[PDB]
DNA sequence: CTGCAGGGTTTTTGTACAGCCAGACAGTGGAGTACTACCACTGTGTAAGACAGGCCAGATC
DNA sequence: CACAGTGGTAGTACTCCACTGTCTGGCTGTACAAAAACCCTGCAG
DNA sequence: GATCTGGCCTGTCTTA
């Protein structure tokens, strides 16, 4: 991912950290093939709910993510309390 | 005094002649001009407290 | 789904150096009017 | 002897 180790988490390294690529690069590390599925699907959920708050006005630029936010966060929370509990 | 109406005033606003210089037009073949994405990649978020469990110290009986 | 940068490049695009004629727009003397905006004075309430 | 409380020291978390 071409990302140096860090002192403090800055928002820039925080934008290059959560992307599907970064996760699929750290997917090679964890041997369990169930977990790959889990954290990977987790990250995709997060990418889906991120533009909701981070975009200036979600009502226009990202409406379909917005309407799905509650349900999406639901799958997310259920995934944490289930697998990562 | 107000109202409008002939004309005054001076001054605008342009058209009237006629000659003439300037720079735009258009060509070119391409010059080398100027302004363009594009490329990874960055800088600014910076210190305390709360809370759980241990367990030893030491007062109280 | 920050943002305002950061220099070199290759891209593109535009706009320039000579040869020429031709064109419109614009200036100069006074003459000639018609508008421009007062203030007059004139005639009326 | 042995409680309770507070202690420090650790010891993790969360924001910064």
Resolution (A): 4.6
Q: Is the CB of A31 under 7 A from strand B?
A: no
Q: How was this structure determined?
A: cryo-EM
Which runs of E-coded beta strand occur in A30-79? none
Residue A23 has a CB neighbour count (10 Å cut-off) of 20
**What are φ and ψ of residue A73, in 5° steps?**
-60, -30
Give me the residue label for tokens 């959560």.
A18
Q: Vertex A55, ends A21 and A60: CA angle to 5°?
A: 120
Chain D bases under 7 Å from protein CB? 16
**CA separation for the pair A61, A58 (Å, rounded):** 5
Give me the residue label for tokens 């997917």.
A27
Residue A70 has a CB neighbour count (10 Å cut-off) of 9
Chain C bases under 7 Å from protein CB? 1-3
Query: What is the distance in angstroms between the CA of the first residue and the CA of the last residue of chain A?
Result: 28
């Amino acid at each position: 991912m071409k990302l140096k180790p860090v002192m403090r988490m800055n928002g820039n390294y925080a934008r290059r950290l959560m992307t599907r690529e970064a996760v699929e690069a750290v997917c090679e590390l964890v041997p369990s093939e169930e977990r790959r599925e889990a954290l990977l699907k987790l990250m995709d959920l997060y990418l889906q709910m991120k533009p909701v708050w981070r975009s200036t006005c979600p009502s226009r630029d990202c409406p379909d993510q917005l309407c799905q936010y509650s349900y999406n966060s639901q799958q997310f929370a259920d995934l944490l309390s289930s697998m990562f509990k």
